[PDB]
């Protein structure tokens, strides 16, 4: 996260960390959507151009965390993946269209003040909240600059009009992607950055006061560049795939 602030404690209790076992390192963020299901970006798991193709055993997930590097004893929980499911039509060859994946944990994670799932949207939640100007919130432990934060960072960024997104880039934008960010004229700034990929873009419904996850941090051309925006997986467009995967392979 570029230009954020420090998260408060339990502010983002769905925030998960995708953590490599060997060497020990942050890869991506992710989000807790049930007691045994974590949501992340497909490119955190599979991105062939960079020889990235993880299995369940290469990775750990860390839920309950605030501090990036420290082992938060009595607070965080660390989980082993039991299965990865990459969206079958995730386009790594072109533009990261359908940049979504699920991970089934080996055992259900126990909730607490620091650990609590986020909601996924319905058709009505999306209709109502995915509108240009409406702000969501992005969280992560990624770089503060295009250096690294002690604790989890937060930034609130406005959803940007569709035309404005396409015209900021030569990459082909699809319906499964929205972009967010301030314009050079709006004065405020902020963006996701390296290591933040996979993490949640969420919005608090004004109707029921529940946090829903509308996007997944998916890509951008640099971090916090004027006239450029970060792109997010449109989580509601790919949710029938989410439910499908959970309805079949879940317990």
């Amino acid at each position: 996260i570029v230009e954020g602030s420090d998260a408060e404690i339990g502010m983002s209790p769905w925030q998960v960390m995708l953590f490599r076992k060997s060497p020990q390192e942050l890869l991506c963020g992710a989000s807790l959507i049930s007691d045994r299901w974590v949501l992340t970006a497909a490119h955190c798991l599979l991105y062939p151009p960079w020889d990235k193709n993880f299995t369940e055993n290469d990775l750990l997930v860390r839920i309950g965390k605030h501090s990036r590097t420290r082992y938060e004893r009595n607070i965080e929980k660390i989980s082993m993946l039991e299965k990865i499911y990459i969206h079958p039509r995730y386009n790594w060859r072109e533009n990261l269209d359908r940049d979504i994946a699920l991970m089934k944990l080996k055992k259900p994670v126990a909730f607490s003040d620091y650990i609590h799932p986020v909601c996924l949207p319905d058709r009505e939640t999306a209709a109502s909240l995915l509108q240009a100007g409406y702000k969501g919130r992005v969280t992560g432990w990624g770089n503060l600059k295009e250096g690294q934060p002690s604790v989890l960072q937060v930034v609130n960024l406005p959803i940007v009009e569709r035309p404005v997104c396409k015209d900021s880039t030569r990459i082909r934008i699809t319906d499964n992607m929205f972009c967010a960010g301030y314009k050079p004229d709006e004065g405020k700034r902020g963006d996701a950055c390296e290591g933040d990929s996979g993490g949640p873009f969420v919005m608090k419904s004004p109707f029921n006061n529940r946090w829903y996850q509308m996007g997944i941090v998916s890509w951008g051309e640099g971090c916090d560049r004027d006239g450029k925006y970060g792109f997010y997986t449109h989580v509601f467009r790919l949710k029938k795939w989410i439910q499908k995967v959970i309805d079949q392979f879940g317990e």
């Binding site: 602030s5 408060e8 404690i9 339990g10 502010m11 209790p13 959507i33 049930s34 909730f111 607490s112 003040d113 609590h116 799932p117 986020v118 909601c119 996924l120 319905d122 909240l129 100007g133 409406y134 702000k135 969501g136 919130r137 937060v154 609130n156 406005p158 919005m203 608090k204 419904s205 004004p206 006061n209 529940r210 946090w211 829903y212």
Partner: peptide, 29 residues
């Protein structure tokens, strides 16, 4: 959706607000 999803124990459950969620609300116009 899970019955209790998206309500955080240190905030919604206790009826406390975090420092910038009003920035999000103020934008839902």
């Amino acid at each position: 959706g899970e019955a209790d999803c998206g309500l955080r124990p240190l905030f919604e459950k206790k009826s406390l607000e975090d420092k910038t969620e009003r920035e999000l609300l103020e934008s839902y116009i």
